[PDB]
Every structure is written in C-alpha cells, then in structure tokens.
C-alpha cells in the first residue's frame, strides 16, 4: 500500500536523508514530507495466491446456476451450502472447492 499527499493528493515517493539517516515519504510536487512508519519500500511476489479467494460477493447465494451441497458449516452448522472452484483462471490453478453458507455467508474449505 502507498500513501497520498495530504495537501495536493499526489503520490508520496520515499526519500532518504543523508544527514539524518531516515526514510521519509515526500511529494515531488511540493515541500510536504511525512515520516515513514515501515522500511518495506517494495515487495514483489513471483508466485502469488491473491485473487484466489478474493473473488467473493455477499449475494452469491442468490445465483440459481450454482450447485448446492450439504456440507457442514464450521460456524453456524447449517445443512445447506453453495460451492464453486477457484476464481483465479491461470493454468497452474488448483481444483479445490470453496463453500459458502446460506446464513453466515463465509468462505471455507474442506481440508
């Protein structure tokens, strides 16, 4: 996550002080400068799993084309649920199922 300038709404690029030895987020369109909280400047994931379970909506139980199972809900122990596979559509994607209860509407696995 990256922060924005509080006065002109531009991006806050990180900057390093030679004399003070501190990491600071500074806007290049002004003189505003705010002290950085964490040193994690950049992170790149070669193999990522985000978007696998992130594709979830709160009204997925009203879809009539989705199959319905009788798996046990971990939270409220309901007897009706709706399952589907991974929303990510790469070639390496697993065939595991995500179950959605019809009362608490949370996503849970079978393992």
């Amino acid at each position: 996550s990256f922060r924005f300038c509080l006065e002109c709404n531009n991006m806050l690029y990180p900057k390093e002080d030679k004399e003070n030895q501190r990491l600071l987020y500074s806007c290049r369109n002004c003189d505003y400068t705010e002290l950085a909280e964490d040193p994690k400047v950049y992170r790149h994931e070669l193999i990522t799993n985000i978007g696998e379970t992130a594709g979830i909506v709160d009204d997925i139980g009203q879809d009539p084309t989705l199959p319905r199972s009788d798996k046990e809900c971990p939270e409220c122990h309901s007897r009706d649920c709706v399952f589907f596979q991974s929303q990510q559509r790469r070639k390496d994607t697993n065939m595991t199922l995500f179950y959605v209860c019809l009362n608490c509407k949370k996503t849970f696995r079978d393992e």
Binding site: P67, F83, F84
Partner: protein, 56 residues
C-alpha cells in the same frame, strides 16, 4: 450447473445410435461432426499446395 466435470456434462454419449441420443448429446455430437467437416475442408488446400511444390 456451474463447475460440472461429470462425463455427461462435458460430452460423453452413453447411448447408442439404436437407443437414441438425448438433446445435449445430440448437440455435442453435432459439434464434433462440424469439427470433422471444417478440418477436412481446411486441410485440403494446404495438402494440395504441398503436393504441387513437391511435383515441381
């Protein structure tokens, strides 16, 4: 339904010609036959061109 990998959902015809196909099997079989016709009518020109170059 969505995410169905059963044989009947993805084009397995379990009936014979004597018994008669169901509409889903009929449509899948028509898709396969259309594939056959397209493949023949498309590869004929490439084969003819290869034969002409070989002869020349």
């Amino acid at each position: 339904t969505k995410d169905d990998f059963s044989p009947e959902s993805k084009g397995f015809v379990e009936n014979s010609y004597l018994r008669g196909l169901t509409p889903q099997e009929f449509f899948f079989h028509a898709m396969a036959g259309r594939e056959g016709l397209i493949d023949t009518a498309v590869k004929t020109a490439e084969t003819g061109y290869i034969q002409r170059r070989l002869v020349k």
